[PDB]
Design a binder for this molecule. Structure first.
Ligand SMILES: *[C@@H]1O[C@H](CO)[C@@H](O)[C@H](O)[C@H]1NC(C)=O
Ligand SMILES: *[C@@H]1O[C@H](CO)[C@@H](O)[C@H](O)[C@H]1NC(C)=O
Ligand SMILES: *[C@@H]1O[C@H](CO)[C@@H](O)[C@H](O)[C@H]1NC(C)=O
Ligand SMILES: *[C@@H]1O[C@H](CO)[C@@H](O)[C@H](O)[C@H]1NC(C)=O
Ligand SMILES: *[C@@H]1O[C@H](CO)[C@@H](O)[C@H](O)[C@H]1NC(C)=O
Ligand SMILES: *[C@@H]1O[C@H](CO)[C@@H](O)[C@H](O)[C@H]1NC(C)=O
Ligand SMILES: *[C@@H]1O[C@H](CO)[C@@H](O)[C@H](O)[C@H]1NC(C)=O
Ligand SMILES: *[C@@H]1O[C@H](CO)[C@@H](O)[C@H](O)[C@H]1NC(C)=O
Lengths: 246, 299, 49, 50, 49
């Protein structure tokens, strides 16, 4: 059933979306990295969902931001046709566990949760191999996530930070730490968002979406080993000069 | 020379030598099930290849020679004789059946039907490939037809990417409409295996082993006994395959829970985490210096 | 400034691969068959020289 | 000795004619033969011992 | 005269093979299998350096 409508707006990302590129300890050094990052001062789309074609493109990677608290948000869907003729991801979260499956789901136009049956998400799944169960990811606060896949490996980074009363993204730096890497090995073109609806009842949600690009960054490590400053080498001539001079 | 003039000369350096050796390996007691991978009496088609994950076990590769009648390994990032010493994070095993003359296509940077439509390997592959003849099991006098491969595809595959969809490939402007007419084909051909073909046209069973280097805590490696932990002495050490010599001391560094190693400006390891007790240790080179000799003339 | 910069560059040069599989001798020795390790050690030796 | 000229060459079909195992090329690679363009091709055939 | 001669020699040096099969990168890339092209590119790189 179709019961959700969406509205869009645009805003500025400032300097957000920095994550540790590897599990190696460093301190009091300046490091140069080449990886998929969110460019500084870029368009980020603000989506408001109220109760619709939420099959947004995936591209190289996705940066997701949420500042809500009602826990109305949970799970994601990934695929290339969102049909039963191709395998798709079914990351789903709840209060106790996270279940990830890679099957050929026959997805619906507007998927959600009855709350707690996924009968409105997919009709059925028949052939698949990849299943996984673990501790759930989601645990005045802002939650930032980064999703990507390289060489058949799906990688997820996340961070949780406290935020004061602000209507826009904050100023400063906050690094992200890796959580999960999996052998996905499928073709991903579009992704999807899942919400839970109680019975239904009116609901509202809002989130920020941005896209990653291959970029070169210069990161600064303090004496304690934390990332506190970064420079994007393709933003303006001054930043390029700083990167060249290190 | 046999004569020395008056002066001061730089001759050599002095170093302290190590006293003993230290080995530290994690708590693993299980055995990796390589036997189940081999002799499975049923191998999948190349277009739909099986993948098995191996983790949290002790790996003894020398027994693999007793499971299949292959001739030799074909490894790229490592050597077959050194596999019993390295320690990895995860192991992946893929198995399928192909033709005799396509075995050369399972290698990094290859081109061909199997390489670009069925199974693709990354250009930075680190692992081993094993192949052996299976004519006595996969051939029938009438002709086996249970093994298939994809022939047509719109775009080339990515490394470690599988395709299962069955549709009608269109080679014309008009839509196929679900019928295999003109300019419309079924992109799944079948090998015809007979026991009377040449060696190049006989079936072959292929198993590919893929390794993951140390980035996370290790889970798979061979049977190496672990000794005690000594400190404040010049000693040889081996932490999860990382070998060296030096002095091990307590560490004040604040490692994050997901970090396992520490590097310096010269990109060499200087901090380590003990596999058994989650404790941080610092590594320093043993004492050394330079020596000069002062003499008058030998006359 | 010149002396410090030259010494720092010389130290930093030790982390290059020069076409080998790794910049650490111990990794090459522990991962490779002994007659096959010389072809990798030679590249590092030549670069450092 | 046979001379081959003025034709379109598709080497991938050669695998369907003889039950050999693999090519042995020196100046080029077998997988790149479908892109290069030559002036003349020569084919020699005989029988020898193993 | 010295400056012109040095620049001309530097330009002329680009046509050497340095033990490779060709002095043109495009020919090597189009004629050789990708993991086998590095052993030929490295010779040219070292000579030009
Ligand atoms: C966001 O995109 C709009 C047009 O889509 C553009 O005008 C604006 O400059 C971009 N950046 C913002 C709003 O920070
Ligand atoms: C969350 O989902 C898992 C997987 O289906 C399930 O085992 C668990 O019971 C769920 N949590 C609750 C509170 O029901
Ligand atoms: C699995 O795939 C086969 C072949 O594509 C198909 O016939 C079958 O309906 C699918 N589902 C199950 C449960 O076998
Ligand atoms: C570094 O860590 C120490 C110990 O927790 C703390 O006292 C100090 O304030 C920290 N400094 C910075 C810049 O984070
Ligand atoms: C396991 O493989 C060996 C190969 O020598 C074979 O002899 C044996 O019968 C196989 N066992 C099973 C249960 O397939
Ligand atoms: C993945 O899906 C897209 C969407 O149709 C398609 O264009 C592409 O060829 C597929 N394969 C790869 C390797 O991107
Ligand atoms: C490993 O085993 C030893 C002895 O059984 C024990 O003391 C130690 O705590 C164990 N460590 C882990 C991480 O299980
Ligand atoms: C051509 O060679 C093939 C090799 O498979 C053989 O089967 C066929 O009979 C040959 N045809 C002629 C006319 O020699």
């Amino acid at each position: 059933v179709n019961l959700i409508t969406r509205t869009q707006s645009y805003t500025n990302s400032f300097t957000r979306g920095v994550y540790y590129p590897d599990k190696v300890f460093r301190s009091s050094v300046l490091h140069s990295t080449q990886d998929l990052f969110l460019p500084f001062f870029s368009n980020v789309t603000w989506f408001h969902a109220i109760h619709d074609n939420p099959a947004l493109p995936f591209n190289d990677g996705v940066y997701f931001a949420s500042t809500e608290k009602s826990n109305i948000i949970r799970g994601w869907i990934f695929g290339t046709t969102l049909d039963s003729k191709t395998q798709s991801l079914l990351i789903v979260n709840n209060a106790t566990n996270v279940v990830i499956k890679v099957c050929e789901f026959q997805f619906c136009n507007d998927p959600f949760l009855d709350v707690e049956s996924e009968f409105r998400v997919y009709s059925s799944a028949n052939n698949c191999t990849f299943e996984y169960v673990s501790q759930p990811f989601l645990m005045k606060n802002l939650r930032e996530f980064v999703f990507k896949n390289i060489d058949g490996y799906f990688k997820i980074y996340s961070k949780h930070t406290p935020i004061n009363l602000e209507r826009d993204l904050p100023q400063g730096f906050s690094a992200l730490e890796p959580l999960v890497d999996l052998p996905i090995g499928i073709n991903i073109t579009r992704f999807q968002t899942l919400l839970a609806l109680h019975r239904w009842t009116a609901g509202a949600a809002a989130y920020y979406v941005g896209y990653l690009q291959p970029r070169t960054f210069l990161l600064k490590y303090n004496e304690n080993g934390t990332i506190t400053d970064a420079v994007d080498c393709a933003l303006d001539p001054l930043s390029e000069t700083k990167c060249t001079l290190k | 020379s046999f004569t020395v003039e008056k002066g001061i000369y730089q001759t050599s350096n002095f170093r302290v030598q190590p006293t003993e050796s230290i080995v530290r390996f994690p708590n693993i007691t299980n055995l990796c099930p390589f036997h189940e991978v081999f002799n499975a009496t049923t191998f999948a088609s190349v277009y739909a290849w099986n993948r098995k994950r191996i983790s949290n076990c002790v790996a003894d590769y020398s027994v693999i020679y007793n499971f299949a009648p292959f001739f030799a390994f074909k490894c790229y990032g490592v050597s077959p004789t050194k596999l019993n010493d390295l320690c990895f994070t995860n192991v992946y095993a893929d198995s399928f059946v192909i033709r005799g003359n396509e075995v050369s296509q399972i290698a990094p940077g290859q081109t061909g039907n199997i390489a670009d439509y069925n199974y693709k390997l990354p250009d930075d592959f680190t692992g081993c490939v094993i192949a052996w003849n299976s004519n006595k099991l996969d051939s029938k006098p009438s002709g086996n037809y249970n093994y298939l491969y994809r022939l047509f595809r719109k775009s080339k595959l990515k490394p470690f990417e599988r395709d299962i969809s069955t549709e009608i490939y269109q080679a014309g402007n008009k839509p196929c409409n679900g019928v295999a007419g003109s300019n419309c084909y079924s992109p799944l051909q079948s090998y015809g295996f007979r026991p009377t073909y040449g060696v190049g046209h006989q079936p072959y069973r292929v198993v590919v082993l893929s390794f993951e280097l140390l980035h996370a805590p290790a889970t798979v490696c061979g049977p190496k006994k672990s000794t005690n932990l000594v400190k404040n002495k010049c000693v040889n050490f081996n932490f999860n395959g990382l070998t060296g010599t030096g002095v091990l001391t307590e560490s004040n560094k604040k490692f994050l829970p997901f970090q396992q190693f520490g590097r310096d400006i010269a990109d060499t390891t200087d901090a380590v985490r003990d596999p058994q007790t989650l404790e941080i240790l610092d590594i320093t080179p043993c004492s050394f210096g330079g020596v000069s000799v002062i003499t008058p003339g030998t006359n | 400034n010149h002396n410090a910069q030259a010494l720092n560059t010389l130290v930093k040069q030790l982390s290059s691969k020069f076409g080998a599989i790794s910049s650490v001798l111990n990794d090459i020795l522990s991962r490779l068959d002994p007659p096959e390790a010389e072809v990798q050690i030679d590249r590092l030796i030549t670069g450092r020289l």
